[PDB]
Paper text:
In accordance with the naming of the PASc domain, the periplasmic domain is termed PASp here.
We used a bilayer-embedded [name] construct, referred to as the CitApc construct, that contains all essential elements for transmembrane signaling (PASp, TM helices and PASc) and the fully functional [name] mutant. Previously, we reported a piston-like motion in the PASp domain along with dynamics changes in the PASc domain of [name] from the thermophilic bacterium [name] (GT) upon switching from the free to the bound state by citrate binding. The contraction of the overall β-scaffold of PASp leads to a random coil to α-helix transition in the PASp/TM2-Linker. This result is in agreement with the conversion of the disordered region downstream of the last β-strand in the PASp core (residues 152-158) in the citrate-free state to a helix (P-helix) extending to the TM2 helix, in the bound state.
Author numbering:
A (entry chain C): 34 to 157
B (entry chain A): 33 to 156
The structure:
Amino acid sequence: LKEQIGMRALNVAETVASTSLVREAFRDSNPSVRLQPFAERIRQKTGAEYVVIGNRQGIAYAHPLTERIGKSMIGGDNKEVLKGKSIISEAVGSLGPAIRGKAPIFDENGSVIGIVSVGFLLED
Amino acid sequence: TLKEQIGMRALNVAETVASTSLVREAFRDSNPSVRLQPFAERIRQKTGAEYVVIGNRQGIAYAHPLTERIGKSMIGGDNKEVLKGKSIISEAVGSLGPAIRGKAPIFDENGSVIGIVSVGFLLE
């Protein structure tokens, strides 16, 4: 069950990472203008705790707490995602145990330009 | 239950696809399949789904894992609740075995339903 909630998280992250809107926003001077409303819409519709979209350093362009945008970093190891891999991992935050999926964002030439990290609270 | 989580996986992918600007915009095109089919296929591949079918209000498939089925195949199962704006999880069977699927409505800018996304995962 924990594995399938992780697959929920990863499938949402992969779908967000493959959306043209997300890839295109990284060409904007402020990617958050387009990234944050989309991430929030997806977070609401799917029941996720967060849909965080960040650059290669993990700096969040989108975050469920808008005051954290540009300040918070995608938590956990991101080295594998920067290699183009998709990663499921367990984590914890103030709201409790979570499982998250991270997917790379690719440009038109296959380079990783960012990370999508989607987390679900471990709860029925 | 693991089956219920696989159904949430299917529905979360369908909801995320249905919320993308590409999918909402493509329904205005002369041939929506030109933009819908490559996106649906990419999401199908990345998520491990058996199918990401995108259809119109009458259920005609504009994207399908078999390109020869575009236009000929209809989204299977009751769609009446989706046209009412509801998201629905259901079980079905096909040539490849039992599957669980989730259906989400596609909305235009005025909140009218313009189509359906149906995502299916094989129970395996």
